[PDB]
Design a protein around this ligand. Sequence first.
Ligand code: ATP
Ligand code: ATP
Ligand code: ATP
Ligand code: ATP
Ligand code: ATP
Lengths: 283, 492, 489, 48
Amino acid sequence: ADIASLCSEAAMQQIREKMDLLDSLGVTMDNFRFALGNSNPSALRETVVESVNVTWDDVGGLDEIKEELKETVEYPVLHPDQYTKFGLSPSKGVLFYGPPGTGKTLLAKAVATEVSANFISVKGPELLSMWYGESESNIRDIFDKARAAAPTVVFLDQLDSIAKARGGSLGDAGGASDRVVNQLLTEMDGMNAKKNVFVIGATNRPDQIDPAILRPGRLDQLIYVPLPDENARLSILNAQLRKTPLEPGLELTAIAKATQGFSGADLLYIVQRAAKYAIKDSI
Amino acid sequence: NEVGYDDIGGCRKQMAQIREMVELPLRHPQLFKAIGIKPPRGVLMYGPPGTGKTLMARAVANETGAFFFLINGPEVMSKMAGESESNLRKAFEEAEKNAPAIIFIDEIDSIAPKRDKTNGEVERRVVSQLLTLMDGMKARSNVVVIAATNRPNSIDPALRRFGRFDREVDIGIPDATGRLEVLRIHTKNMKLADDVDLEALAAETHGYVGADIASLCSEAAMQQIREKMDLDSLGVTMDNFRFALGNSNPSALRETVVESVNVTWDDVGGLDEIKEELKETVEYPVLHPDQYTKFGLSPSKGVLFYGPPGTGKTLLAKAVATEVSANFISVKGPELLSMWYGESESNIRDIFDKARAAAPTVVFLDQLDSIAKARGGSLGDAGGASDRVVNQLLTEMDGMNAKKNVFVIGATNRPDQIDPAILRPGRLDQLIYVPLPDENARLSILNAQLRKTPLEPGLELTAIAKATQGFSGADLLYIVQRAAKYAIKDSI
Amino acid sequence: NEVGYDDIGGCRKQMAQIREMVELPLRHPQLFKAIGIKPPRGVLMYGPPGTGKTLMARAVANETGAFFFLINGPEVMSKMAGESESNLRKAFEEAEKNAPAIIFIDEIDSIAPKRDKTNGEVERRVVSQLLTLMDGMKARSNVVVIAATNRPNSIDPALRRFGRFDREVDIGIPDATGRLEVLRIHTKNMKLADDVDLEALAAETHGYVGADIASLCSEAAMQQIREKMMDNFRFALGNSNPSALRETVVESVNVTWDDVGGLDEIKEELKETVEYPVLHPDQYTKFGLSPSKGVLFYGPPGTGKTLLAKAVATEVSANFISVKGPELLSMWYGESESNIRDIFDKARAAAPTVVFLDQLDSIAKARGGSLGDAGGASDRVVNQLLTEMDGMNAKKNVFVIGATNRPDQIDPAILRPGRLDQLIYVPLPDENARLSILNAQLRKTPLEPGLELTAIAKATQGFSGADLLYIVQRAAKYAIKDSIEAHRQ
Amino acid sequence: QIFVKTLTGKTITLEVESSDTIDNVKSKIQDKEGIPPDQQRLIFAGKQ
Ligand SMILES: Nc1ncnc2c1ncn2[C@@H]1O[C@H](COP(=O)(O)OP(=O)(O)OP(=O)(O)O)[C@@H](O)[C@H]1O
Ligand SMILES: Nc1ncnc2c1ncn2[C@@H]1O[C@H](COP(=O)(O)OP(=O)(O)OP(=O)(O)O)[C@@H](O)[C@H]1O
Ligand SMILES: Nc1ncnc2c1ncn2[C@@H]1O[C@H](COP(=O)(O)OP(=O)(O)OP(=O)(O)O)[C@@H](O)[C@H]1O
Ligand SMILES: Nc1ncnc2c1ncn2[C@@H]1O[C@H](COP(=O)(O)OP(=O)(O)OP(=O)(O)O)[C@@H](O)[C@H]1O
Ligand SMILES: Nc1ncnc2c1ncn2[C@@H]1O[C@H](COP(=O)(O)OP(=O)(O)OP(=O)(O)O)[C@@H](O)[C@H]1O
């Protein structure tokens, strides 16, 4: 239905230009380019349909970590027969946790460069908004459709806002909102590796989640993203300065050499102030 | 006795925009031939009440002579046997019998809103009746539907589609001398004097969407007839409109202060360094946003502040609402906190959704220690916990567009309750501790109050300021508050 | 039955502006034709119910001779949502036929509630009928609508926007001269003697709504009938309960500034802050900011903190919000910060009004990043206290008093000019203040003048004033025993 | 030191409005309705 809006709005834009005292009304490329700007796809805070992924050498370093991520989203797609000949279940889930700065999206969306399918994600506002029914029923169309609409990658974040107090030793007393830790566990054994499914869990506190999420058989592959060292922090400053008119005569290593406890956010903090006074020179 | 196109001004850009989608499908439908496409039907208007949504609907109906129809929100909503589903299709076939025709559905959020609350009532099957009714309108160039509401986010997103309701337009606030056009319509029938001037009224009436302007000229006529004890020549005067400014409230009965507190740049005492650093806020990149696209990097997202209380965290926090006069909002700390557990994450959602919809905007926060809570909930065990209020804003503020004038600014008194991810770069970058003023900046602290009061020049301005040896910026207000009750002393 | 203009008073300043609102467009509709604009249609009244809200509309109806249409609130809204829209259609059609006409409705909050989280009511199809009926009909028709309600903030905000209900009047409780006027009205037929008073009988009420004056007169008249087989008004106050019974508008203690003695460093220092902007605000608008709201009282136990609470509240005869110490009820997690905000908005509606609190400073114990803490109360309610105390306005000039007994646990953020800043130590009563307090308390006792209280002040050196109140209580309790052993022999 | 919060939900009504059994209408036809003042209704006789 959105493809019908792209052709009908460009023709309506063209007749808003051609109007004075019906001779030639060929729809131009700029009318379709303007229709891409002012309009939008069907993602009006619904299930998100996008494939925003970055290529390689966009996170600095990774020369010893890139071989650890190529065996979870490429090899089940490129060679599926290696699991069917042996009989093993492929690990479709990898838990991610690391230092501040990076870790949420750019360390997970740079892994799936070869698939580039639709990414249906849960996030902050996708929580218990309705007090009845719409707590795990908004997740039931994510679990059952992942094997029906394969390939579809589902990202999982904000682990301290879903199962923090409910899965603990004290739990929930009263049956008010204890309906969150059940469907996250009973949909694990009921799902097999028949179709292309993939889940990624990422958080800032790995011990704040229930230990039944880390049950064997589903999270047998634990990959830890570490802090970028001195050999990787210099290439971070060459990665987030991509679309910039950067003079190559300077040394970006001397900025990164004074960063020991400073993560990629502080590398983003030290480079944002360099762009504030750069436009002020033009002012 | 009907209105016309000249009956309302101030929305001349939105008038010429909305006149294209009603005249071209009816007057000259031949432009849609030999171009392949189909003329659209739905036009969506939305804005605050008192802006003239139903006035613009009646003005476009009588100026074209078409078969106008009216469908009300709370009227056609039945509980008998599904009669609302039969009366919606009854209004569509009656409008289809007469060509050309136009229907109007006001307060469309009242008829079948989004299912975040109800989700099981008959309104789920009411909106799906409206889906197949508008999509089955294969009669070309006959019926044009217009709608009006107040909240575009409470409606279901299935209406914003290709077929039924596209081409939405926001009826804004007439700030760029638009209130002068409203005063030209209403005061053209009243008898006027020589002292009045409509250009000296729109500059002082901030907001004033149009309904209160019609109440202002009527209340000014009440002040003119008040002096008549009871052949008659009343007129008006400049003092009648000045009487109606103070003795009548503007559109602020819902929220007390949302616009400003009527301050300026030099109302904070001292702190000229933070006045320079406040010129790197939303004053800077609005008039030139293409430089960050040229330099290929996003601007600064958030600046944080913490320090001693009473040093300018309400004056400078509301001075941003006056130096650009943007769409300010006012929200307190635990006022964001609600009594329901499921509302704990959606209350920050509608506040941030109004910020991207009212661009450019200015938001702020006070007492984030009740909001951050770096331990992440005290004990637990309850049906709801204090952990979703901080873990939702840390992700939603990352999922915002950079070119939409969204930012945050802080005002706290405790640097230990706040989380380290709250003070993260990319969300709250500049860790700026607000300082206690020295002896060079505490002279203009008293001068912030002495600008408006007639202080005698014989009194030394620095003699009272030299008694401070480590005081705060609010403590010199306490002296002029003590002097506010120590100056009169004999005039009772 | 047939009431007139001279039957009610107190709101005469509002009764004069009503007579230019409903009588001037009806008697002279051509005056609005000369000025061009249309006459106003809707004016509503509110306040406490029983100040004569229904009697006010019937008084102006019989004093004009026009048609008087009446639609009851809880009567036409209790139907099955089908006859209410036709009753309102019959209401405006009949008033147009016999113009000039007025339309009086009462209890509009039962017809027009607000939209809240507790959805499930009808809430529609009746008020929307009133919206499409009232915006028309302005073709110089001699019709006006008058609304009446109890809570003026439970009404839907779509009514009070423009053109439907734009003018409002606040008929509240009368003053001391207001109850004096209605006392002469309700006693015009009872053959009283010369022993009754009028100024002292009005001043001894001080909180009585106008509906109580008819009941208090009939209770004293019935007592005079029963003694046949006239100072019975004081018997009627001891038997009958005053209206607004268990609200926050209590006034039953009538201690003035004469009944409390001493502490002249607090009496003149409370006259400087809470009587000067509420009486003379012409100098406060050109000498900085007007209000001096916050004031703190600290000292020893029983030093006379709340003895001066009701004394200042009856000097200007304003309202007195008596909120106790642990009034943060804290049934859950979110309402504990919300139940303190509506009582501040009520203080802005009934402004000026003194508010009282007791020991709610808990941000020094609300440290950052620890383990021992509550579930949301006594650590985040001070964050609401850091934003709801300085919510001031130039058209209200409120003031809030505060009395505590521990000045060591004062928060570093609550001792601020944006918060309660004026702290005053309430000291012990000295040898000159001991006579001024105790003599004003035994004024009601018919004592002998031989016993002077200078010997009490010489026998009490480090005693507080509440301990001196035990001495006159023990002297009166044994004077009761002296009166008990006087009628038995 | 904690709380329990739970909301509710309702369903209003449906109706059919079914009435008028056939045995009540057959009794409804065979009756009278009244005649003004002098609107007699007559008798008649014949066929000896
Ligand atoms: N290779 C890299 N190493 C470190 N930082 C990077 C790199 N590439 C980009 N960045 C910058 O660091 C930020 C990544 O931070 P991120 O979004 O992971 O926050 P996070 O706190 O780690 O996520 P989470 O909320 O899941 O903990 C980006 O905003 C980006 O500008
Ligand atoms: N050109 C204009 N722009 C804005 N306001 C106007 C204009 N002309 C008149 N007004 C005033 O604004 C009011 C129009 O408000 P209106 O009746 O449309 O309420 P509304 O809430 O927009 O309608 P609805 O109930 O359909 O939303 C009128 O009462 C009128 O006095
Ligand atoms: N430039 C200035 N520096 C210091 N104080 C000022 C200045 N200008 C005005 N003031 C006075 O100081 C007070 C500002 O205090 P403010 O409202 O910020 O309290 P706060 O405790 O800092 O706020 P918060 O509750 O957010 O901590 C005002 O009442 C004002 O009279
Ligand atoms: N000026 C006055 N002020 C107060 N009370 C008065 C006054 N004059 C008369 N009264 C008495 O008070 C009563 C008025 O009460 P009223 O009939 O208004 O009840 P109400 O509850 O206010 O009306 P409603 O049902 O509309 O709320 C009368 O019965 C009358 O005896
Ligand atoms: N001027 C005064 N000085 C001393 N005592 C007084 C004075 N006026 C009244 N009192 C007596 O002291 C009592 C006041 O007690 P109240 O609880 O109001 O203050 P308090 O004794 O300081 O209590 P707290 O210590 O809880 O504040 C009254 O019962 C009264 O009899």
